[model samples]
Target chain A: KKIRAAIVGYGNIGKFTVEAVEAAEDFELVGIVRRQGAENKPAELAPYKVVQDIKELEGVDVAILATPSRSCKEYAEKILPLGINTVDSFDIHTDIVDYRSALMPLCKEHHAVSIISAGWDPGSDSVVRTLMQSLAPKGLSYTNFGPGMSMGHSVCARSKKGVKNALSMTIPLGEGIHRRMVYVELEEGATLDEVTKEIKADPYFAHDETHVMAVDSVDAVKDMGHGVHLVRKGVSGKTQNQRMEFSMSINNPALTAQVLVNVARASMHQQPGCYTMVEIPVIDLLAGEREDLIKALV
Target chain B: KKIRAAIVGYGNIGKFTVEAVEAAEDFELVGIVRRQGAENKPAELAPYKVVQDIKELEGVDVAILATPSRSCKEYAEKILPLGINTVDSFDIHTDIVDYRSALMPLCKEHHAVSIISAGWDPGSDSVVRTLMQSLAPKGLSYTNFGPGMSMGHSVCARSKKGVKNALSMTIPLGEGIHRRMVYVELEEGATLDEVTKEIKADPYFAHDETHVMAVDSVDAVKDMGHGVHLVRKGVSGKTQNQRMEFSMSINNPALTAQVLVNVARASMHQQPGCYTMVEIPVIDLLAGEREDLIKALV
Candidate 1:
């Protein structure tokens, strides 16, 4: 059965999710779920119906919740209570605990699978880290994200006063730390120093080493590519000196959207509850007969 | 409940398998299964009784067949019929279909789970390749293996007449091609040219670039470390320029053994049948409270 899936919130990640769903042979695009005042849908999305709420759609097996990080939990409450599975690119590293905790009851009560944090960092990398742990069981594993764009950080910069546009890239320092390079397109009246101070004081850029640069236009030098270098070195059982490294460069929203849709497929085979990527079997996330996949890949 | 796991074939990989099983909290060592007259067991294995048949063990849940590639299929028939699952690091890239096809009925008829190619190259890399496919869906993936010791090639070299010992390393030149460096310790009155001819003529090294060198002692400069760099570039839906890369360096047998024992754990969770890594949920190979893991990682 084709997973009748919908894209909630028409944003950068949402439009990508729609493309991912349509590209997939195992899924069908239901519609786009936009808010009442959010009527500026893209021209490419002109053919698809845009509704105010998820309930307006007759059938949406799962919704890729592509709203801002702070917006996910509230949206989860709205959608999960209606028995629709939800997949999100929610990017808060610390608040994930409270996020999963808050959604459990509603998901169980309505028999919906809310696969939290389905994007690349919290999504694919999260699963990869656990699989490494299984190999080593005792080790220090580190994931160095980007020398590429940081969607959340860029979004935060754009939200600041006097900023026309912003592009933030993450430089992964070894051993779980990062430095951010933020490029801002200034509004006519805004000065670089003025906007930099506000961005550096914000919660997103405060803890990390963030450099603010003034650019003529953010669109003039924009690239949405992202990648990661994941490393683990430790002992596997009694044997010592076991080491592993995994690296990937990706089109950020494209891969993130694909991950969301695949997890939507996985959620279909699961019992109702909130889940992270590691909790589900990896096979269920892929399409095709289990035996056929085994034959081709294995 | 602890999985009662056994190691069959007392070789380099088998010794590591024993260590991996014992290291896991979810598994218990059931004893070793060795062939008759193959009694030169390691001093480390003195405490455990080595048996001739898997049937000799009272409750062997699964046996990790760390045997030669040629031996895995025939051995599967012996163990699977007794309703005991099997995990093997069987490394033939081409003959995998016959291996799985050959074992499926025995696995199904007797209700046993057989997990194929549980080692690193065809083992871990196989799973990683399929995962990259899921992210891109339409892409080209390339896996470049170590500059590390190859167990099979080295073993093949030592088996040649008039060779005291051998070490073979693989150099991956990307795009599914490899060149081999074979180092040999010559026996009394044996010339380098003699064994080099035999080693290169064998099926193992015939198609690839093989270089032979004379070493003072294979034991003096031997290292079993291995690693890989995996890359995939493709399109997701209408979005182009999607790319991904994963790389890892490892203690070959240690990681391979861990993969084997973990697949044994995964097998216990599976229905009666044969499978490859992509066919199984990646979660079953891991051990922990699903919630606990999700909290820590996601």
Candidate 2:
């Protein structure tokens, strides 16, 4: 019998995810938790339950929580105790400052299937680590990972608490309260290749010599190596111009999902003390070992 | 004897102010109190006594604080106790937050002469009242005022410690954080008057209407007549357009000097219980009062 999977919060990406899951053979759609007024209800769940209550999460085997960050602590406390495997559609866990260290105890106590940074940053952050395994470089020159989550509907017009704290998390340990938007233009007649080399060799950042500069950039990948690199900022039209050095576009929720995917897989194993991504034997399985992952063949 | 004034903290504005004072016949340069250093003493201070230490502030009747806001409070604490008249040049003194209540007790206890809102927003804020009184019809639409004190220095740069708080003096209550730089363009047929009226008619500005929006800008003005008026946020420009409905520009130091002149005149009066610029009887003497004029108040 396949594991029964339930998804809570059917947003756009959540819909896409469920659509993807429908194509998967190992998982069976059991039940979903929807917000009280959410418009759409899956027609396929004709006789299955669609609930608004966490108390009703009785027969569900695996739960995927597609919710906002403000609700993470609340849901994490509730769902984990019920003995069901849980995954969060990450939206909020980008910067981890002043996040009380006591939460780790709760995760350990329940033996809960939990994952953070599931799909993107921490997911790809580990992927960055994985890329480094073959050729151990001096240090990571740049971290050019973009968790390409759409910002349009996710954050637009939404006012959430802890936003100020979220921004505050970007400040390094000793950096003062001085923030500036960085815009840089390379000298004329420089090719993208030239800029990439320049950034790879001499990567400069503001707060810390190691990591002061930040932009939501896609090209930062090439510069992550041992040389100077120039990366373009912005995700769309102006996304590729050398007008600015680097921009970091990241999808925080997906990042958390990737991390959670890794951790959830790790939870299946019976390790006691501080297991990391490197310890996992089947990284592919934890990373949702999709056959298309191999098919893309990067 | 002429009015003797001493400037401390001879930074960017400090040096320029001394030049203006030297150029003006009404001011008698006593000396500048700068921290011990000088590859070059200011050329304008050649005729003035360049005194060091707070003790050198002894004979000067009016002390124009040109230092940072942190030092301004420290100066107010130190100099006010000595029973000297201080024309506070620090922009931060314009703040009227919950913390501002502390200053009143401090002032009463010190028993020295201290006048706030001597800077432009506060200084011209006073004039705004005068302008509103003079130009506004029986019913004013709105009075929007903002001061452009953003320095061109690095993002790490601050005008002064209290400057942010002081600059905030003109900010309407319950407004969101102020962002820098916006270019407003009307469609081909759009006129400034229509836009101006649109802003004035806005009901959300009811709290801001005809209200002395800032202590600094208000303190600059003596009074206002009853009417609905809009106090729009102010922006800074290198020059002012005479044709504009409500706008004013003057150097911050010049405004401070005028405020000093007002404060000096207030101290000389036998009858005083908090006088404003409009109520002062002797306009010429108040306007002409100088550093040597200190002894008369004492």
Candidate 3:
């Protein structure tokens, strides 16, 4: 039997969670609870019941709270008592200092489970970060990129002749769009303007929204570049360095929804208490019938 | 006050496990079991009692099995019955179908917990592979580099000119030593010999052995390269690709020993059943007093 799922909050992220739960294999969308009246519900939410109060939720085996960060804690308090397992993004509480101590008793009392910081960033990234730590396990450093402006223009400059070294990063601009910025170390005779023009005209930069910036040295760019990069020195041995650098082009809301649904599915079988993504098994997130999913994951 | 720990199979890996338990804050090394006679016991194993049989173990709260992969199953069969929680590398069981189904009853009967695949590849890499999946979740592709060969060679190639693009991977040789293999795309005018000579002459390559190979293309190398590099595309968005490429120079045995100890420490508090590194909390692996260790992991 499919587990009944409800989405609390029908705002931007909440709307995505509703869609994710509806599309999930193991979950049957029971309803969406919105503090705001459902008078202007989007067409996609039409198939599920919409209510203005948490009290209206019924037969929900799991509840994915997509409300604002602070509001999720409050909503969790309300939902756990109703015997619904909860999944929260913890968008605000990066540390989650006292969350478990605060809510675990209530969840246990009602025999409901709560998974905190189960979305992207604190969610999957937490898992990723942990794996990285385990792999390297020592002497690690992390840098976060984006949530900023472009680095494309600088990339163009880096590609020009007399550019001895170069790196580029893209800042996400919602949806699947981005603005790129580049950094370069030029040869003594190189002209920044000439290189910049050369790069802007390059085919790769033609479609991208590009920005150019100059740094005194490549070391400066390595530290200040605006993209996702993690470097661990001597992670496994005395002579190795592990580096991960990449940029994303994605429909942010949809992916967030996907993570929410997958995590919610896994949360159904968890022991009653507050847990984090780090504590859940990745294999359990897959739909049980899809054994081939493991192949895709590895 | 500390959990008593035992090491089974006092060979190369087993000896490291013995030291790991002694060094761990939460564990007291209680004994070392060896199939070979302990006529000439090593000084490191001096503090602990040496036994030839699992039955001789007393007050051992947990056993970290560093025996041969096949032998571990046999050891676990015996150890679980003694009510000792176990930690194993599970180096052989990728599927774990027979192992879990067969041994689960024994663990349950004794109310013991076991952590399987608790080593480097099945151990930490499982966490890495899972995070890679969760990040991309869909439209994913995976490639694994070297379980053999070395990274010392490839890193040398990366530093030479005319190598338009290149990646080097180091495979763990026993005791943290590595051999490097490099694949490179040379500039149009660049000669492979010139690049090879330049790399071999580099000071970094002076002390280590390396192999430099030419690849027709980066795409070909992506499919057919050996050593450390994991690239995941479309993790967040349509055009996004995440790449983790680097090599480690490490004391492999020491690191493997460290991972076993940490997982052993974490497994002590786990529910009585089987689990993997993926299901345990990353923070829980740290000794209670070394909360600051998390700082080194990221």
Top candidate, metric DockQ:
1
Candidate 2 lDDT: 0.38
lDDT of each: 0.83, 0.38, 0.64
Per-prediction DockQ, in order? Answer: 0.51, 0.00, 0.13
Q: Which tens-of-lDDT digit does each residue in B34-71 have in candidate 1?
A: 88623876788877778888878778889889898889
Docking class of 2: incorrect
The TM-score between candidate 3 and the true structure equals: 0.68
Better of 1 and 3 by DockQ: 1
Candidate 2 per-residue lDDT over residues A1-298, each given as its tens digit:
4556666766643453454345445456665678762245566555556778656656666566666656655676677677665655343333322222334556667665554334433332332232221111111223332222224211321122211100111221221222212212333453434433333333222232221122233233211111111122211111111011112222233223323323443445432222222222222232233222211110
Chain A TM-scores of each predicted structure, in the order given, are 0.90, 0.52, 0.69
Estimate, for each residue in A3-68, the C-alpha lDDT of model 1 and write its tens digit: 998888777788788888888888888788887523876788877778888787878899888888
Model 1 stretches astray by more than 4 angstroms:
A36-41, A73-84, A95-113, A154-168, A183-203, A213-222, A269-273, B36-41, B81-83, B101-112, B155-167, B184-203, B214-221
Q: Which candidate is the best by TM-score?
A: 1
Task: Give the DockQ-based CAPRI class for model 1.
Answer: medium
Number of the candidate with higher lDDT, 2 or 3: 3
Best by lDDT: 1
Tell me which of candidates 1 and 3 scores higher on TM-score: 1
- What's the residue-level lDDT of B285 in candidate 2? 26
lDDT of 3 by residue, B1-298 (tens): 7888888877656766765665555678877888764668888666668878867877888888877677777888888988898887765534654565667688888999887778655566555666556555544444444553323344446657888877665554533355666678888898888887787687655555667777887546542222344445543322244333223333445556667777777877777877666666666665643224322322
Cα deviation of B118, candidate 2, in Å: 0.6
